[PDB]
Amino acid sequence: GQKVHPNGIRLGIVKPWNSTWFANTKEFADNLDSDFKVRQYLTKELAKASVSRIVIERPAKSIRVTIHTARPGIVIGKKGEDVEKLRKVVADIAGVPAQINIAEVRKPELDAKLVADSITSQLERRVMFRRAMKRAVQNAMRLGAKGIKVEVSGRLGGAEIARTEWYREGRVPLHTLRADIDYNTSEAHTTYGVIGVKVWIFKGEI
């Protein structure tokens, strides 16, 4: 392992921060722990809601959480009912009054993290990984990605010895910082161990 994280190096250039708020050294730590403590619940409770990305703002003793999902009708629910149920619980965790803004994710197979979470599912649904990575790679090309590289590793399909597989189509300029690369990871907990998933998606040069 020698490649650097592409989202981390692209933070000051083209990829926005996953959380933007200010704190001095007194409350910086408890800001981070509470920023974590909101994050498992939103991924656990809304695992069926196909959540892609979560952003936190802290505007002067409040919290604004931006949930990016491809199926907003699940998290909002029937007749606008479940967001308010989600409203007090994050305030219960954070201790401050907060407001959550639902951000819809149109064009869903062009987001790496939702691609990573969707490609997580069928491996623990025990279908073949060869067809799975193939399905996740042509539709990005079909619906207009400019480059996609995916990766799996570790006990594929019941293999007793770990093997790594990667499919790449298009262009993935990982060494170009101004290029816009979409990348996030996910894991699948099969009966044999841990399937690893890495997926890079490139869309634009600036």
């Binding site: 933007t20 708020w21 200010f22 703002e57 604004r64």
Partner: protein
């Protein structure tokens, strides 16, 4: 007289934030000192990357606290009612000292 201290982690975020304050203050009472650029405290941090060994390889991140100053020197208390309605972005800290 009235000192507005503005601190943020981003220079591309604080410039409009200090523009919103200095334009609204000059709009309804005028006479505002220029938005002062002030030296940035850079917290450079050394972290080991590997879980177990190889000390010699490390990562290098840093925190850049972009700090700005805006001064109001004259009594212009018509602004001080509507200036609280600005509700600026979350990435910029503001401190007021009189």
């Amino acid at each position: 007289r009235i000192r507005i201290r503005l601190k943020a982690f981003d220079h591309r975020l604080i410039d409009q934030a200090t523009a919103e304050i200095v334009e609204t203050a000059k709009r309804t009472g005028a006479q505002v000192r220029g938005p002062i650029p002030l030296p940035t405290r850079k917290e450079r941090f050394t972290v080991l990357i590997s879980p177990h060994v190889n000390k010699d390889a490390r990562d290098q991140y840093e925190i850049r606290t972009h700090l700005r100053l805006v001064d109001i020197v004259e009594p212009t208390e018509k602004t001080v009612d509507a200036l609280m309605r600005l509700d600026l972005a979350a990435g910029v800290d503001v401190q007021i000292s009189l």
